[PDB]
Amino acid sequence: EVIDKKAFKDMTRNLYPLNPEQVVKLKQIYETSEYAKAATPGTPPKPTATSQFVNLSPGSTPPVIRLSQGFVSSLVFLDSTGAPWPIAAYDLGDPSSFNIQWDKTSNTLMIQATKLYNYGNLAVRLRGLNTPVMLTLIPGQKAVDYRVDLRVQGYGPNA
């Protein structure tokens, strides 16, 4: 009847071949595996919500927005008195690297970098401005602009 005993020890080996020590071994191995896969190269961008004054006179450099691959950056458009400026429309350069969403009435442009460091620019004409607003969008910086309170030079339909 030890025939039976050796059969059974043998296949407590075979059917379930990882003694439960080995199964938590593999669980932890995979844990570290895709924790390493989850690791970011270097320090990630600092999440900052900034505010900038937009200067539209000739000779001024355009506002520059820090982005990051796969992160939302929201641009809100504000007049000199701090009231919202609804957007007329926008035209983004190279949207194969950037993805922009906007509900068609509001004044919030939410942009993600679909590529790591490929930068571009974006024009946005507003309700009250004949001249639109330029912004150069650079991803992969040491900071990520979660939101930019850009302060347009003019006075909008809200005063």
Binding site: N19, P20, E21, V24, K25
Partner: peptide, 9 residues
């Protein structure tokens, strides 16, 4: 840190 179900007496 201990996973005692990998237990050996």
């Amino acid at each position: 840190c201990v996973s005692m179900i990998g237990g050996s007496r």
